[PDB]
Design a protein around this ligand. Structure first.
Ligand code: SF4
Ligand code: SF4
Ligand SMILES: [Zn+2]
Lengths: 96, 176, 208, 170, 126, 48, 113, 95, 114, 376
C-alpha cells in the first residue's frame, strides 16, 4: 500500500479482485513485539483441602485386559458396532 | 457433512455453447492466467535485504547454547546431570569433582553441536537456569571439530550473550 | 476422577466383548484367546495355521466387513520359544470399528502370507522379512525393502545391537565406499532408569 | 611407481596423441621393473613400524623385469590402441623434448623425462627389498587394467582383464 | 501330514548375521541382577538377565570420550526364567555362565526382643 | 528504522567499514551486530 | 430412481436390484444348507441372510430398501452378498467348526513377561 | 587469575594443561587455546559475607524465580560462615 | 519334535536346491564381472563363491539350509539386475581391512582381546 | 532427481516411453527410528515424531501424545485440546500448500510455489512464536502442550486467516480452470473404490474415489466433535478430483481455524497430574514434592501401565497410526509408526498401469509422499 493509484487500478483490473482490502504483506496492524507480562491461572488440583491423590489417580485405575474366551443359546448375530449413519449433504456449498 | 466436489453438469443452450466455443477458439482462461501474473508483477516483493535486514524472530528462539552466571560472577551450574540425562541425542557429557572450596562444580561440560537437535530439553530441565539456548544462529564453522563445544567455549558464549539472554529470560519466564 | 482421569467407555467394551464371543464361537478351530483391553480394544490371539481362514472371514462376513488393513506388525519377545508375534490391525468402514489379530511364530517355521486377502500386505510382511527374518510362505516378491543391499542380519531383532557390525566410509585407494567393522568415537551410554519400587499393583505377577 | 594418479603408465598412454610413440633404438635395450604404489606404501608403513629398519637403505622393485618395447606394447594392448613404433635417434628426441617444456604450466615432457624413461633399472641385490619388510610385490598384470581403463575408447571399455596377452619378461 | 521330523539341535548361528569373532570369543552371563544396596526396593531382581563380558574402552584423542570397538557392549536381554535364557543362549551358539538366584533368608523379627529380661538383645537406646 | 515499510523491512542496519582491525567496507557479516542491538534488529522487542 | 452414477468409481449401476439380491440370497442359503447344523456359522449366516431376504422381499422401492437395509447403496449390498457367497464356499472348503488344532504354550499370551 | 605454564600454554580453572611432551599441542600451533579469564572461585571469593540477625536464613539466589531453589542455612556455628549450596554466598550471625 | 518344513522334506531336496543355486551362481559370475567392470578375474569370483558356499558347510538342519538357499537366491536376484553397486559386489573382497593377528603372541602384543 | 521427493529409486521398465513396470526401491532414508525409540524414554522419543512427516510435525506429535495419553489413562485440559486442534489445522494448511505447490511444480507450474511459500513462511513464524523452532516444534506433549501462547498471537492468526482465502482464490484461478492443467490430470491414475480399499489407501485416496470416510468425523478425537466442517468427495478418482479435494480441505481447514479462534476456553495447558506432566518452574524452586517430581520426570520419566494400543488420527496424508506396546517400564517396548506413504507407494504400481512418463510423475505428485515417514 505504497504504490500510486494508476498501478493499483491496473493491478486490480488485471487480477480481477480487490487486493488493497487484503494485502499479503503485514503492516502496523499486527500485534506489538512487546507485551504486558501474563498471569497464567492454576488448574483444578491446586487446592489445600480435599486434594487426596488416591481419589484422583489416573495410572492406578488401569486394569489388565478383560480376557473373555480362553483355552486355558439362540442369541442374535452381533456386529462390532451399529452401522454408521449415512452422511448428510452440506447446506452451505452443496455443489449440486 | 460432505459436499460433491466436481459433479456439476455443464449446460446445453446455444448461448452457453457459443460462449464455450469462443473460449475454446480464443483462449480466455489463458488470458486470465496472464492477467494474474501481470497483477503479481506490480506488487511489492516480500524480499528482505540480508544481511542488513534480518528476518523477524521471537524471544523463545532456540539457537546456540550458553552457560549463564549468577549476578556475582559465580557460574550457575552445580553439576546435577539432569540435562545429560534428558538430552535425547546424548549430546551432553558431564564430569564433575569437588573443587578447592568444596563446591559442587563441573570439570568437563561438552556439548556436541552436530549431535544436538536444538529442542530445548536441557534449558527447560535445568533447575538453576544454568544452561540456556541463546538466540544466536549465525555460528556456522568451516571445520567439523569446531562444532564440539567444551566448557570454556560455552562459558565464553554465555559471557558474550548474557546481555540478551537475561532479557529473553525476563521476557519469557512467566510462561514457564 | 473427573478432570484428570480419562473417561471410560463401557458401551464399546460390552459391544466388543459380545463381538469377541461371536468370533470365538464362529471359529473354534483357530481362535485361542479373546481379550478386551481397558481402553476398549479387541485382541484375537489365533493359531498361525488359521491366518488365512480367519482374515478372509473378517473381510467377507456381512457382520464384520473389515475391508481395510491398517497396519501389519511384528513384535520380538526373546523370552518365549516362539519369539515372533505377528499382529494384524483391521479397520471396518461399514460398522466403524477396529480389530486386532495376533499370532506367533519362531525363526524357522514359516507362516502363510495374506496377499490373497489384503494386497497392501504385499509390501508390509515383506518389511517384516527385512527386519525380523520371519519367512512368509507363498509370496509374489519377497526381498529386502529398507536395509542396505549387502546388509546381513535383521536389525529389529532384540539380540541385534543398536549400532551394526559394519559401517561405510570412503576410501581413496580403491576409490570406493567400503565397509569396515564399527568403531564408535563415543559409546552409547546405557542408562539404568528402572525404578526399584513396584508401580502398578494391578499387574503384580504371582511369585513362583 | 605406477598407479591411478601416476605419471608413468599415463604418460605412455598419452604419447598416442602426438604420434607413433618413438623410442631410442625401439627401446629394446633398457630394462625396467615398475612397482605398484600400494606395495611402496605398505613398505613405508612397515618401515615406520619396524625398529630394525633404522639406518638401512631399501630398494623397492617389482617382481618381473620387462624391456621397454614390450612394456609399451602391453600398455597399448591393455588400453586397446594401435601401436606403431618407429626408430628415432637419441639426439633428436631431446630436441623435441625441450620443446614441450617451454610451457609456463606443467610441461607434458622434458629432456630429463626422456633420459629417465630410457635409463635401464640397475640391480642391487645387497639392498633389502619389499620381501624383507613382509610385503609381497604385486605384478603389473593385476593392476594394469585398473590403471589403464580410463584411456580406452567406448568400443573396448567393457573388455575383461583376461582378454590380453601378457608381455615377456627377462 | 505336512510335518517333518527334525532331531538335531537348534542352530541359528548362520542366519543371525553376527561375525564369528563375536560368537566364538564371547562369554555371556545369565543371572538375576543384584539389588542396589543404597535403596530398599526389590522390583529390579525379578527377571533373569543375559549380559556380555566387557571389552576394551579407550580414550578419544580429541575430546577424551570413551571410544569403543565392541558392538555388544550395551546388549542386555531379559528373560522370565533360567531355562528360557539358557535356550536362547545355546540357540545362538554362545558360551554361557549361569549364576544361581540368591533369595535372602527369612528372619524371625520380634519387637519384644528389644526389652528382654535375661538376654543380651536389650537395646541400649531407642 | 522506517515504520512506513511493511513488516520485516521496517528496521535495518548499515555496517561500519572498520570492526576489530578488519577492513569490512565490502565483506559485511550478519554476526557483526552486538547483542544489545541484536535484540532490536531481529524484531524481538520494540525498545532499542 | 434410475441413478446416473452410484457415487463410487468403478462400480456400475444395477438396473434390477431386487431380482439380483433375491438370486444371491437364495444361492447363499442353498450353499449354507450343506454345512452341518451344529456349526454356529451356518446358524448365524442363515439368520442374517433370512432377515435380509425378508427385508428385500417386503420393500418394493429402492431408496426405502436402501435406507432400511443399513448398507448404503444397493450396489455395495449386492457386492457384500457376492462376498458372503464366496466366503460360504471357502468355509465349506475349510471347515473351521472342528475343535482347536493345538493348545498354545504356557507362556505364549502372558504380558508383561 | 590465569597462570601460565612453562611451555607458554594457559591453565584453565579446572587445572587442565597439556604436558611438555604431549603431542596434542599440535592442535594449538597456528591457532589459539580458548580459555575463560573470569574464574568463578576468585569472583565468588570477592563477595562479602552478609551479617544477619537470625539463627537460620533462607537463600534463593536473588531474582525469585530466576534463581536457584530456596534453601535454609543454619548459622549456629560462630567459627565458620554458613554457605549456600548453589550460589556460594556466605552468611553469618552477627552475635 | 514334529516341525513344519519350508521347502525340503529331508536333506536330499535341500542339498539339491543348494546344488542348483551353486550352478546358477557359477553361471552368473562372468556376467557380474563383465557388467560391473570389476578388476578381478573370473576364477577369483568363482573361488569367492566357493568360499562363501563352504563357509556354511556345517549346517545339518533342513529349515536353516532352506533359509540359506532363499537368501542366496535373493542375493543372486539382486546381482542379476544391477541393484547392487560396485561397492556392494566388492564388499565380499575385504580390500581395505588389514588382516588381524592370528596366533597367541601377536594377539598378546596388540591388545587385550582373546 | 527433481521429480522424486528427495530419495526414491524407481527402476522402470519402459516400452520406449510408456511404462510397463515400476519398481520403487526405498530405504535410502531408513534411519531405523523404531529401535532407537525403544532405546529412549517417552519424552525423549517425542521429538522423533517431528521428523517422520517433516511437513506435518504437530499432527504426528498429536498422534503420539494421544497414544501415550490413552496408555496412561489421562486426558489433557480443554484449552490444551483446542490449541492442539487449531495448530493441527494450521499444520494441515502447511501440508496441503506443500502438496499442491510441489505437485504443480513437477507438473510444470512453478509460480504458485512462490505464491504460497510466503503463507508457509508466515505459518512457520507462528510455529516459532509458539514453540521456538520453525519446523520441529516439540510442542505437543502427552498431557497437553508444553507452553502457553504468547500474547497477541491470536490477532496475527486472525489476520493471516483473513487474507489466506484470497490467496487460495488466486491459486484456484491459476490452476483449476487451466486447460493444460486439466490435460495432465483429467484421466490420469483412476483408482476404483474396491481397489483403493483393498490396497490400504487412506485419506484423500479414499475421498477422491467417492468413499465417504474421514477420521475426524467417524472416529473423532478431543474437540473435533465440537467444530463444524465439510468433507470434500471426489467422483472420478483422477488426480484432478483429488487436487480439488485438497483445495477444499484447505478451505475447510480455514473454517475450523476460525471456529477454534472464536471458541478458545481459559484454563491451564498441562494436566494437573504432577506425576506425568512436569510442574511449573516457580513451583519447582519452592515446593519439595514439585522438585522431586521434576527430578524424577526429567531423569527417569513416568511409568506407563503395561499393555498395547493402536491410536490413529487423520493426518493430511491420511490415517497416521501408532502401535505402542509398553511393558510397565519408563521406556516403550515397541513403537510402530503406520504412515499412509507406505500403502500409497505400494499402490503406485497399480496406479501407473498403461500410463506415460509424465503421467507417472503426475501420479507420484498427486500422492503427497514424504520418505521420512515411508522409510520410518
Ligand atoms: S537442545 Fe536438546 S538435543 Fe540439544 S543439547 Fe539440549 S537437550 Fe540435547
Ligand atoms: S541441568 Fe543445569 S545444573 Fe544440572 S548439570 Fe545441566 S547445566 Fe548443570
Ligand atoms: Zn543461594
Amino acid at each position: 500500500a505504497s504504490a500510486t493509484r494508476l498501478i493499483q487500478g491496473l493491478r486490480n483490473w488485471a487480477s480481477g479482485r480487490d487486493l488493497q482490502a487484503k494485502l499479503q504483506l503485514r503492516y502496523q496492524e499486527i500485534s506489538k513485539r512487546t507485551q504486558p507480562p501474563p498471569k497464567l491461572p492454576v488448574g483444578p488440583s491446586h487446592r489445600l483441602s480435599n486434594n487426596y491423590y488416591c481419589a484422583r489417580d489416573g495410572r492406578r485405575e488401569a486394569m489388565p485386559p478383560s480376557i473373555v474366551m480362553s483355552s486355558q443359546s439362540e442369541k442374535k448375530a452381533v456386529s462390532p458396532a451399529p452401522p454408521i449413519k449415512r452422511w448428510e449433504l452440506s447446506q452451505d456449498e452443496p455443489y449440486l | 457433512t460432505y459436499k460433491y466436489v466436481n459433479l456439476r453438469e455443464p449446460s446445453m443452450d446455444m448461448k452457453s455453447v457459443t460462449d464455450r466455443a469462443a473460449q475454446t477458439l480464443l483462449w480466455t482462461e489463458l488470458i486470465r492466467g496472464l492477467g494474474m501474473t501481470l497483477s503479481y508483477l506490480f506488487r511489492e516483493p516480500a524480499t528482505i535485504n540480508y544481511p542488513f535486514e534480518k528476518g523477524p524472530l521471537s524471544p523463545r528462539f532456540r539457537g546456540e547454547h550458553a552457560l549463564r552466571r549468577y549476578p556475582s560472577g559465580e557460574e550457575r551450574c552445580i553439576a546435577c546431570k539432569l540435562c545429560e540425562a534428558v538430552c535425547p541425542a546424548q549430546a551432553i557429557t558431564i564430569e564433575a569433582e569437588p573443587r578447592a572450596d568444596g563446591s559442587r562444580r563441573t570439570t568437563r561440560y561438552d556439548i556436541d553441536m552436530t549431535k544436538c537437535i536444538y529442542c530445548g530439553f536441557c534449558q527447560e530441565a535445568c533447575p538453576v537456569d544454568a544452561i540456556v539456548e541463546g538466540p544466536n544462529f549465525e555460528f556456522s564453522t568451516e571445520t567439523h571439530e569446531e562444532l564440539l563445544y567444551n566448557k570454556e567455549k560455552l562459558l565464553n558464549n554465555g559471557d558474550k550473550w548474557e546481555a540478551e539472554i537475561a532479557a529473553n529470560i525476563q521476557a519469557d519466564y512467566l510462561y514457564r | 476422577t473427573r478432570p484428570t482421569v480419562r473417561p471410560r467407555n463401557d458401551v464399546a467394551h460390552k459391544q466388543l466383548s459380545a463381538f469377541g464371543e461371536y468370533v470365538a464361537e464362529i471359529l473354534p478351530k483357530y481362535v485361542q484367546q479373546v481379550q478386551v483391553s481397558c481402553f476398549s480394544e479387541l485382541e484375537i490371539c489365533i493359531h498361525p495355521d488359521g491366518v488365512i481362514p480367519v482374515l478372509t472371514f473378517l473381510r467377507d462376513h456381512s457382520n464384520a466387513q473389515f475391508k481395510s488393513l491398517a497396519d501389519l506388525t511384528a513384535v520380538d519377545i526373546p523370552t518365549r520359544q516362539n519369539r515372533f508375534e505377528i499382529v494384524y490391525n483391521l479397520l471396518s468402514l461399514r460398522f466403524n470399528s477396529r480389530i486386532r489379530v495376533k499370532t506367533y511364530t519362531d525363526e524357522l517355521t514359516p507362516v502363510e502370507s495374506s496377499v490373497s486377502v489384503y494386497k497392501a500386505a504385499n509390501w508390509y510382511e515383506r518389511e517384516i522379512w527385512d527386519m525380523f527374518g520371519v519367512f512368509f510362505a507363498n509370496h509374489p516378491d519377497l526381498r529386502r525393502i529398507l536395509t542396505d543391499y549387502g546388509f546381513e542380519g535383521h536389525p529389529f531383532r532384540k539380540d541385534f545391537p543398536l549400532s551394526g557390525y559394519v559401517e561405510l566410509r570412503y576410501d581413496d585407494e580403491v576409490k570406493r565406499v567400503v565397509a569396515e567393522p564399527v568403531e564408535l568415537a563415543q559409546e552409547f551410554r546405557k542408562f539404568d532408569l528402572n525404578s526399584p519400587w513396584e508401580a502398578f499393583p494391578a499387574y503384580r505377577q504371582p511369585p513362583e | 611407481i605406477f598407479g591411478r594418479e601416476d605419471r608413468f603408465l599415463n604418460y605412455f598412454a598419452n604419447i598416442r596423441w602426438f604420434g607413433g610413440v618413438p623410442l631410442i633404438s625401439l627401446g629394446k635395450k633398457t630394462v625396467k621393473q615398475p612397482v605398484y604404489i600400494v606395495d611402496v606404501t605398505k613398505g613405508i608403513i612397515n618401515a615406520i613400524k619396524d625398529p630394525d629398519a633404522r639406518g638401512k637403505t631399501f630398494a623397492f622393485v617389482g617382481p618381473n623385469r620387462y624391456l621397454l618395447f614390450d612394456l609399451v606394447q602391453y600398455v597399448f594392448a591393455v588400453a586397446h590402441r594401435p601401436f606403431l613404433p618407429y626408430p628415432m635417434p637419441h639426439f633428436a628426441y631431446r630436441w623435441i623434448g625441450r620443446l614441450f617444456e617451454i610451457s609456463p604450466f606443467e610441461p607434458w615432457t622434458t629432456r630429463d623425462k626422456v633420459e629417465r624413461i630410457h635409463t635401464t633399472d640397475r640391480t642391487l641385490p645387497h639392498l633389502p627389498g619389499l620381501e624383507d619388510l613382509g610385503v609381497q610385490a604385486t605384478p603389473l598384470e593385476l593392476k594394469a587394467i585398473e590403471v589403464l581403463r580410463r584411456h580406452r575408447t567406448y568400443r573396448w571399455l567393457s573388455s575383461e582383464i583376461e582378454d590380453v596377452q601378457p608381455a615377456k619378461t627377462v | 501330514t505336512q510335518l517333518i521330523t527334525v532331531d538335531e539341535k537348534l542352530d541359528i548361528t548362520t542366519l543371525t548375521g553376527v561375525p564369528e569373532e563375536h560368537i566364538k570369543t564371547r562369554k555371556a552371563r545369565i543371572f538375576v541382577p543384584a539389588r542396589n544396596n543404597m535403596q530398599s526396593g526389590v522390583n529390579n531382581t525379578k527377571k533373569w538377565k543375559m549380559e556380555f563380558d566387557t571389552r576394551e574402552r579407550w580414550e578419544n584423542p580429541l575430546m577424551g570420550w570413551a571410544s569403543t570397538a565392541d558392538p555388544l557392549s550395551n546388549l542386555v536381554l531379559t528373560f522370565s526364567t533360567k531355562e528360557d535364557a539358557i535356550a536362547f543362549a545355546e540357540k545362538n551358539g554362545w558360551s554361557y555362565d549361569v549364576e544361581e538366584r540368591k533369595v535372602p533368608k527369612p528372619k524371625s523379627k520380634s519387637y519384644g526382643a528389644n526389652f528382654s529380661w535375661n538376654k543380651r538383645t536389650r537395646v541400649s537406646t531407642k | 528504522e522506517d515504520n512506513k515499510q511493511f513488516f520485516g523491512r521496517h528496521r535495518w542496519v548499515i555496517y561500519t567499514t572498520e570492526m576489530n582491525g578488519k577492513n569490512t567496507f565490502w565483506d559485511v557479516d550478519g554476526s557483526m551486530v552486538p547483542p544489545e542491538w541484536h535484540r532490536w534488529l531481529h524484531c524481538m522487542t520494540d525498545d532499542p | 430412481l434410475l441413478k446416473k452414477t452410484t457415487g463410487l468409481v468403478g462400480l456400475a449401476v444395477c438396473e434390477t436390484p431386487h431380482e439380483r439380491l433375491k438370486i444371491l440370497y437364495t444361492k447363499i442359503l442353498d450353499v449354507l444348507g450343506h454345512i452341518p447344523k451344529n456349526a454356529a456359522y451356518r446358524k448365524y449366516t442363515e439368520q442374517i441372510t433370512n432377515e435380509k431376504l425378508s427385508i428385500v422381499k417386503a420393500e418394493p422401492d429402492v431408496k426405502k430398501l436402501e435406507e432400511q437395509l443399513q448398507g448404503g447403496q444397493i450396489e455395495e449390498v449386492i457386492l457384500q452378498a457376492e462376498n458372503e457367497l464366496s466366503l460360504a464356499r471357502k468355509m465349506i472348503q475349510w471347515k473351521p467348526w472342528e475343535p482347536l488344532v493345538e493348545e498354545p504354550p504356557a507362556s505364549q499370551w502372558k504380558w508383561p513377561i | 587469575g590465569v597462570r601460565t605454564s612453562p611451555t607458554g600454554e594457559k591453565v584453565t580453572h579446572t587445572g587442565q594443561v597439556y604436558d611438555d611432551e604431549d603431542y596434542r599441542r599440535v592442535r594449538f600451533v597456528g591457532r589459539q587455546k580458548e580459555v575463560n579469564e573470569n574464574f568463578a572461585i576468585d569472583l565468588i571469593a570477592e563477595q562479602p559475607v552478609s551479617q544477619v540477625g537470625s539463627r537460620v536464613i533462607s537463600c534463593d539466589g536473588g531474582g525469585g524465580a530466576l534463581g536457584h531453589p530456596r534453601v535454609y542455612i543454619n548459622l549456629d556455628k560462630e567459627t565458620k560462615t554458613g554457605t549456600c549450596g548453589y550460589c556460594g554466598l556466605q552468611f553469618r550471625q552477627q552475635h | 519334535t514334529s516341525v513344519k518344513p519350508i521347502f525340503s522334506r529331508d536333506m536330499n531336496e535341500a542339498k539339491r536346491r543348494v546344488r542348483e543355486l551353486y550352478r546358477a551362481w557359477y553361471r552368473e559370475v562372468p556376467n557380474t564381472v563383465h557388467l560391473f567392470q570389476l578388476d578381478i578375474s573370473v576364477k577369483q569370483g568363482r573361488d569367492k563363491v566357493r568360499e562363501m558356499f563352504k563357509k556354511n558347510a556345517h549346517v545339518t538342519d533342513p529349515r536353516v539350509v532352506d533359509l540359506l538357499v532363499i537368501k542366496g537366491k535373493m542375493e543372486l536376484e539382486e546381482t542379476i539386475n544391477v541393484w547392487k553397486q560396485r561397492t556392494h559386489v566388492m564388499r565380499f573382497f575385504h580390500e581395505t581391512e588389514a588382516p588381524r593377528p592370528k596366533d597367541f603372541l601377536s594377539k598378546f602384543y596388540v591388545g587385550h582381546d582373546p | 532427481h527433481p521429480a522424486a521427493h528427495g530419495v526414491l529409486r524407481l527402476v522402470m521398465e519402459l516400452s520406449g516411453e510408456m511404462v510397463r513396470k515400476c519398481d520403487p526401491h526405498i530405504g535410502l532414508l531408513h534411519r531405523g527410528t523404531e529401535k532407537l525409540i525403544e532405546y529412549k524414554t517417552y519424552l525423549q522419543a517425542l521429538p522423533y515424531f517431528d521428523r517422520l512427516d517433516y511437513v506435518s510435525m504437530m499432527c504426528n506429535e498429536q498422534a503420539y501424545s494421544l497414544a501415550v495419553e490413552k496408555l496412561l489413562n489421562i486426558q489433557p485440559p480443554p484449552r490444551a485440546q483446542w490449541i492442539r486442534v487449531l495448530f493441527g489445522e494450521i499444520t494441515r494448511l502447511l501440508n496441503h500448500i506443500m502438496a499442491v505447490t510441489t505437485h504443480a511444480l513437477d507438473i510444470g507450474a512453478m509460480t504458485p510455489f512462490f505464491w504460497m511459500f510466503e503463507e508457509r513462511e508466515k505459518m512457520f513464524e507462528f510455529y516459532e512464536r509458539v514453540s521456538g523452532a520453525r519446523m520441529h516444534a516439540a510442542y505437543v506433549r502427552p498431557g497437553g502442550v508444553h507452553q502457553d501462547l504468547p500474547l497477541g498471537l491470536m490477532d496475527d492468526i486472525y489476520e493471516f486467516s483473513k487474507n489466506f482465502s484470497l490467496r487460495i482464490d488466486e491459486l484456484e484461478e491459476m490452476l483449476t480452470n487451466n486447460r493444460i492443467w486439466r490435460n495432465r490430470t483429467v484421466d490420469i491414475g483412476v483408482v476404483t473404490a474396491e481397489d483403493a480399499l483393498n490396497y490400504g489407501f487412506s485419506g484423500v485416496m479414499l475421498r477422491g474415489s467417492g468413499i465417504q470416510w474421514d477420521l475426524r468425523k467417524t472416529q473423532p478425537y478431543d474437540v473435533y466433535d465440537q467444530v463444524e466442517f465439510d468433507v470434500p468427495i471426489g467422483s472420478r478418482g483422477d488426480c484432478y478430483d483429488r487436487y480439488l479435494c485438497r483445495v477444499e480441505e484447505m478451505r475447510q481447514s480455514i473454517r475450523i481455524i476460525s471456529q477454534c479462534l472464536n471458541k478458545m476456553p481459559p484454563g491451564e495447558i498441562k494436566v494437573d497430574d504432577a506425576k506425568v506432566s512436569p510442574p511449573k518452574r516457580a513451583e519447582m524452586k519452592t515446593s519439595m514434592e514439585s522438585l522431586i517430581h521434576h527430578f524424577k520426570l526429567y531423569t527417569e520419566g513416568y511409568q506407563v501401565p503395561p499393555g498395547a494400543t493402536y491410536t490413529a488420527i487423520e493426518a493430511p496424508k491420511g490415517e497416521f497410526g501408532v502401535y505402542l506396546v509398553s511393558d510397565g517400564s519408563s521406556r516403550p517396548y515397541r513403537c510402530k509408526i503406520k504412515a499412509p506413504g507406505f500403502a500409497h507407494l505400494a499402490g503406485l504400481d497399480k496406479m501407473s498401469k498403461g500410463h506415460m512418463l509424465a503421467d507417472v510423475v503426475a501420479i507420484i505428485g498427486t500422492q503427497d509422499i514424504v520418505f521420512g515417514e515411508v522409510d520410518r
